[model samples]
Target chain A: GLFGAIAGFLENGWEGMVDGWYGFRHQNAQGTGQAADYKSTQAAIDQITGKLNRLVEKTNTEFESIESEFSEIEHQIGNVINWTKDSITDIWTYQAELLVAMENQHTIDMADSEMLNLYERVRKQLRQNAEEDGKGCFEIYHACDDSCMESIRNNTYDHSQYREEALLNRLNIN
Target chain B: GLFGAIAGFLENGWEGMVDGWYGFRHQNAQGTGQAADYKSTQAAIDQITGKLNRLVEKTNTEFESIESEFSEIEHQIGNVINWTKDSITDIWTYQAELLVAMENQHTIDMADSEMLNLYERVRKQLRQNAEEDGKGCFEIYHACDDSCMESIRNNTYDHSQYREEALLNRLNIN
Candidate 1:
């Protein structure tokens, strides 16, 4: 259940951030009808530099956020896989212990049946938990991938818009 | 000038590829007017997985192209920088050799003047070439940045479209 929740959170955050980037691109600073007059090439370059720097900063920040999310998801997946492996190991240990207990006649038929019943129940629950976690991780991984793709696409478009706007400003000076 | 043409080609190719991605997204396989019926969870998962894999492969291929363009630009910039450095170093060597020649009695006044004139011309040409190449590199760097941004933005949109189409198909199943 914890793994499920984490996966859900990562997926949602990834999608939300991508949406934010798209919205930002749509309202790109250079494209938003700002002042477009420059006395010289240096002036134009300076202004474009300022805008471009801000965009680069914003982009790098977003990329950091995305990488962090992916890292967290990967961590969660690793935990689930490790936990499943440990559970299987523990089950094997339990079976060996149960065999030893059965060899000692001190363990009656009724007690043995009860112990086996509990073991079966625990094993079933653990296996189901592992399966569910694996499935969740798989879905989240794919979802995060989609979000990554979205971010890359959005960033590319935003920069293009920035370039076009800057070029337009430079052309105006000409 | 070589960098300029390369940048132009990269910029055009980036935009064209993005447009193609957008068109593909619009006509996504998941969104195609096919049978919207998914008989089971496995069926839905399998269908989504197929579409997702295709999108991933396409995105990765496009990303490789963008990276290759950037790498080439970087390599060109490096060449210009190194060429400028070497040219400056050669100019210093020339100056030292000229000074030694000036101290020689074999050098006449008119010959000295002619040699000085040639030196000035060479120096001027080297400085101009360096400046021009530097400027060209700067412009190409900015151009490459713009193309990169465009690719990210366009890729994000393409993936978002992919997500939306996949979700619609999943919803149809539920």
Candidate 2:
């Protein structure tokens, strides 16, 4: 009943009544109706702006979710018919490059092993000759002569030249 | 030079100059600075509202376009890993219901052919007997008694009963 009476009074001449209220009560204030209208429009602007921002935020989030879902689905089902294929194997054909790499690794391993064995044997021989002759490391290594380097490089090294040295001369060189 | 002078005047106390312009020329005007501020804010609100409306429209359109593009992509990529699967086959496994349907259709065709052959044979026999016995269709059909109808239903029929009619007696019955 109170609300009804209030609404009736508003419908009759609320504009004038509101203006009188503001005009009489406050001297600095202008027409209450105009100010109220401006305030209403301002309120509307704020409300709409808020709604617009939320809509944009929600839309962006939804799109991100959709993209995530699509990516996940594409990862499944035969690699999505190879549409998402990129350096990925086991879904399509096994990579030939990977196979070649495997073979190349074996080749490198074998060569490394051969070089290690050769170097170990040469080092042992060089050590034995150096101790028997009692010489410096570099001196014992070069004892085969510069010509013998070709033989060493060619995997044909023999300690013949170092052995051929006279015993006292070798001791003096050491 | 004119532009330079104008800019210099504006940088130093343009606020007072602007106030003088409005206050002196336009009576009933308030402070120019406050009015300008309100106008600027009003202009900003209008601009922001336009931008917001456009942003909302573009966002909605983009989402629709994204949905369309995603739908097309899903269709292209192994039915999107059966995520888009619904009464669709070949991407997952062929439908067993379709296979069953094909077999059932073949079965129906065979039975229809058998029925057609049986009916054709019965119609030809009935026509021949109707002429030979000089009898009506129903009479000739029932000549082997009501029990003969069962033979028709059971796919067991003989021409002997219809042929057993004598000449003058058959003519009278017809």
Candidate 3:
């Protein structure tokens, strides 16, 4: 339950950034043709977090379907004793696979935490820049948003996106 | 599922025999003092089959509850991936234990089959004796019924009742 709540919070935070940037770009589109330096690193962080979110959702859906199937089999064999020995074996095997899937999910979640922290640090940087007299909020927001969208488009399905040393170190797969 | 079906069938068959014997005993309670030759061997058969039946039911109940708990844990941790690695080790250990349980069940089933065959042979003997020209059905039934009841009353919960070479050999529990 706590994990679910945290995932929801992460997703909401991600969407908030996207929405905020869209609003900023719209408001300053009139006479202000100025734009701040783009932060490709922040875009990379957004792309990775979004990917992690999708992975979490996907794993949960897959496991839900699998658990439902197990229930169906259990109900079918409930009246029979002769078949329980074999049916139990099936469940035990699936349970192992389920555990591994869950572990992968755990690994991803750790990576997501690290990625979110990096994204937050970048957000703080953008905020400081926006407040500075020389920098325009609209330009900085658009630059970050556009760069993140580009990264997401380029590597939405790539597992290699998980290349950050700190994130990988936290996985502790062994 | 097949195991469940077999257990149900065995239980139903056992109850059927009990009901049949009770009816026979009640009907022949009058002046018929005739008793069929007592078969302690048949009593042994009954005891063993009864034990196997309970064993089956007990294993099923225990496995059912364990499965329910797994489902609950799966549901609780489904959205979160952080707990998978530790949880998987639990399944691996449980899998080994499950294999041992299945092997025990297999041994018991084999032994149960042998015992049931012995039981069937005894049933045939009673059937033959009842159909003989000189003997009345009531006397033969009473004899078998009384013998079985006595054996049951003498030893209901004794696991040592499975002392027959054929049944013991079939168990292969070692």
**Per-residue lDDT for A25-57 in model 3, tens only?**
212323322222134345545755765776467
Best by lDDT: 3
* Residue runs of model 1 more than 4 Å from their true location after superposition: A1-38, A58-76, A79-174, B1-57, B61-174
Indicate the worst ten consecutive residues by lDDT in candidate 3 chain B.
B19-28
Worst 10 residues of 1 chain B by lDDT: B58-67
Give model 2's TM-score for chain A to 2 decimal places: 0.29
List residue ranges in candidate 3 displaced over 4 A. A1-97, A100-118, A124-127, A130-174, B1-174
lDDT digits (tens) for residues B1-174 of candidate 2: 011111111222235534321111111123112112222234434554664565467333442232443455544443343333321232113223333433443343333333333334455655434321111112342344444554543446565555645222333345
C-alpha RMSD of each candidate structure in angstroms: 37.6, 54.9, 36.3
How close is every model to the real structure, measured as TM-score? Answer: 0.11, 0.20, 0.20
Q: In candidate 2, what are the lDDT values of residues A30-139, reduced to their tens digit? A: 31121122222343345346434532432111111213434554345545434433323332234335434643553333333332233333343343233422211123
The runs of at least 3 residues in candidate 2 whose Cα sits more than 4 Å from the true structure, single-residue gaps closed, are: A1-174, B1-111, B124-127, B131-142, B146-161, B164-174
lDDT, candidate 1, B78-167, per-residue tens: 565456446645655674475346323222322232222222222222221111222112111111223333332233212222333343
Which stretch of 10 consecutive residues in model 2 chain A shows the poorest summed lDDT? A20-29
Interface RMSD of each: 37.8, 48.5, 36.4
